[PDB]
Amino acid sequence: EYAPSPLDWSREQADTYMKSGGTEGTQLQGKPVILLTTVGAKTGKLRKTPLMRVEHDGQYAIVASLGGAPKNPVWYHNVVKNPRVELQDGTVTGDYDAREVFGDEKAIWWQRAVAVWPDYASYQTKTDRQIPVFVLTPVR
Amino acid sequence: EYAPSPLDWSREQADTYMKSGGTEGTQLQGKPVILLTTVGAKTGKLRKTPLMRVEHDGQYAIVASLGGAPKNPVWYHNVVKNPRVELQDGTVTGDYDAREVFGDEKAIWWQRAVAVWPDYASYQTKTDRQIPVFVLTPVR
Ligand SMILES: C[C@H](OP(=O)(O)OC[C@@H](O)[C@@H](O)[C@@H](O)Cn1c2nc(=O)[nH]c(=O)c-2cc2ccc(O)cc21)C(=O)N[C@@H](CCC(=O)N[C@@H](CCC(=O)N[C@@H](CCC(=O)O)C(=O)O)C(=O)O)C(=O)O
Ligand SMILES: C[C@H](OP(=O)(O)OC[C@@H](O)[C@@H](O)[C@@H](O)Cn1c2nc(=O)[nH]c(=O)c-2cc2ccc(O)cc21)C(=O)N[C@@H](CCC(=O)N[C@@H](CCC(=O)O)C(=O)O)C(=O)O
């Protein structure tokens, strides 16, 4: 009662990430965090979203978890509509194309994500909604 | 003169800016440079555009001119359609609302811009078309 909401923390972390040029706000419980920029599905405004860092050979994966909620985070719809995103990993920023993965291809990235953030597994057991995963490829 | 083509240079400067987290690529002939993020008017894709830094009390101005050429840079149309932009000044990134300015209000910012980059004045004498200027106001 009177404490900030999980959404307030997320906003604050994003802000710190931006103000600091990727030097602060890059961690959550000692695990690395990236900053995603998406284009609003409806408004066309830039939205900043801290997410866990899941990386393999220059590609990143992002997970639309929101704890184990019934409904996807709003940013999920931004990525689907506008797959050109920006991902900042510490001081390094790049543009990427995002592609939702399914089945066996997803299970690969899902395992890599759980290795970074074990709670993802627990999130999935809390809900029948299949937690989306996108794979991000640098533009070349 | 062994200069790179203006497109290639722009891409490269933007890239350096992004890779370095605003620590490199922030200068052009000893004058400061910002990195503008816009949403494509038609595609909805993120575009990164290095521009001269023109600043006053937390607001920025940006000037739309490739030399004194007949047609506006294409990013001009992105800002008109999608006035919510991002501006990176060195390590600092923020969200801004952009509005095109005219008459007396423009002349104020035009003076500040010429102080930073005198060539702007010369660009305007090469064309009857009035070189656009936007004023960017922080939001959030
Ligand atoms: C070719 C095009 O680039 P541009 O026209 O944005 O280039 C303008 C240049 O000014 C920039 O490269 C700029 O970075 C250069 N520059 C500077 N330029 C300055 O002006 N001022 C400065 O102070 C400055 C400083 C500066 C300092 C260092 C440096 O390295 C460069 C600097 C492009 O990327 N094309 C791409 C993307 C274009 C795009 O955004 N496309 C939109 C299309 C929206 C549109 O145009 N809508 C209508 C237009 C119709 C109409 O106009 O009525 C349509 O296409 O139907 C989208 O994605 O949606 C492509 O073809 O794919
Ligand atoms: C409430 C909403 O948030 P959301 O995008 O649904 O999801 C909440 C997010 O904070 C949340 O998903 C993540 O940021 C939280 N989060 C992680 N969330 C995850 O899902 N996965 C992670 O791995 C993760 C890691 C993480 C690490 C650190 C941290 O601080 C937060 C982390 C929001 O930001 N609303 C904004 C923007 C909404 C938006 O994009 N609007 C759209 C359309 C909206 C409409 O249709 O009404 C538009 O502009 O077009 C607003 O209402 O103005």
Residue B37 buriedness (CB in 10 A; 0-12 / 13-18 / 19+): buried
- DSSP collapsed to 3 states, B83-120: CEEEEEECCEEEEEEEEECCHHHHHHHHHHHHHHCCHH
Burial of residue B51, with CB atoms counted within 10 A of its CB: 0-12 exposed, 13-18 middle, 19 or more buried: buried
Nearest residue in chain A measured CA to CA from B19: A92
In angstroms, the CA A59 to CA A57 distance is: 6
The one-letter amino acid at A22: G
3-state secondary structure of B9: helix
Closest to B18 (Cα-Cα) out of A51, A26, A95, A45: A95
Residue B122's SS3 state is helix
Task: Count how many domains chain A has.
Answer: 1
Identify whether the C-beta of residue B127 lies closer than 8 Å to the C-beta of residue B69: yes
Rounded CA gap, B34 and B22, in Å? 9
Query: What value does the CA radius of gyration of chain A take, rounded to a whole number of Å?
Result: 14
CB-nearest to B21 from A22, A46, A84 is A22
Candidate of A37, A74, A123, A127 to mutate for ligand 2, largest count of ligand atoms within 8 Å of Cβ: A74
Q: Please give the backbone phi and psi of residue A46, each rounded to the nearest 5 degrees, phi first.
A: -80, 130
Method by which the model was determined: X-ray
Q: Characterize B71-95 residue by residue with b for buried, 16 or more Cβ atoms within 10 angstroms of its Cβ, and e for exposed.
A: eebebbebbbebbbbbbbbbbebbb
Q: Which residues contact A99 (CB under 8 A, 6 or more apart)?
A: A83, A134, A135, A136, A137
Domain around A121: 1-140
Asked if B16 has any chain A CB less than 8 Å from its own CB, the reply is no
Q: Are B62 and B137 in contact (CB under 8 A)?
A: no
Cα B36 to its chain centre, rounded Å, is: 6
Three-state DSSP state, B62: strand
C-alpha span between B117 and B140 (Å, rounded): 30
Alpha carbon of residue B96 to chain centroid = 13
- Supply A60's token pair: 């990143």
In this structure, is the dihedral angle defined by the CA atoms of residues A108, A111, A115 and A117, taken in order, positive or negative? positive
Q: Do B21 and A91 touch (CB under 8 A)?
A: yes
Token pair 């993965």 in the structure block, residue: A101
**Strand A133-138 relative to strand B27-28: parallel, antiparallel, unpaired?**
unpaired
Please tell me the distance between residue A106's alpha carbon and the centre of ligand 2 in angstroms. 22
Query: Closest-CA residue in chain B for A42?
Result: B44
What's the rounded Cα separation, in Å, for the pair B109 and B133?
A: 8
The residues pairing with B93 across neighbouring beta strands, listed in sequence order, are B88
Chain-centre distance of CA A136, in angstroms? Answer: 11
- B98: Cβ contacts below 8 Å, ≥ 6 apart: B62, B79, B83, B84, B85, B134, B135, B136, B137
Assign 3-class secondary structure to chain A: CCCCCHHHHHHHHHHHHHHCCCCCCCEECCEEEEEEEEECCCCCCEEEEEEECEEECCEEEEECCCCCCCCCCCHHHHHHHCCEEEEEECCEEEEEEEEECCHHHHHHHHHHHHHHCCHHHHHHHCCCCCCCEEEEEECC
The candidate with the shortest Cα–Cα distance to A49, out of A137, A136, A140, A138, is A136
Q: Which amino acid is at B106?
A: K
**CB-based contact (8 Å) between A91 and chain B?**
yes
C-alpha–C-alpha distance, residues B135 and B60, integer Å = 6
What is the C-alpha separation between B113 and B56, in angstroms, rounded? 10
Measure the CA–CA gap between A131 and B80, rounded to whole angstroms: 37
The residues facing B89 across adjacent strands are B92
Greatest Cα pair distance, chain B, in angstroms, is 45
Which ligand sits closest to the CA of A27?
2
Q: Give this entry's resolution in angstroms.
A: 2.5
| Closest Cα in chain B, distance from residue A29 (Å) | 23
**What are residue B62's DSSP bridge partners?**
B134
Note whether B136 and B59 are within 8 A (CB). Answer: yes
User: If you compute the radius of gyration of chain B from its CA atoms, what whole number of angstroms results?
Assistant: 14
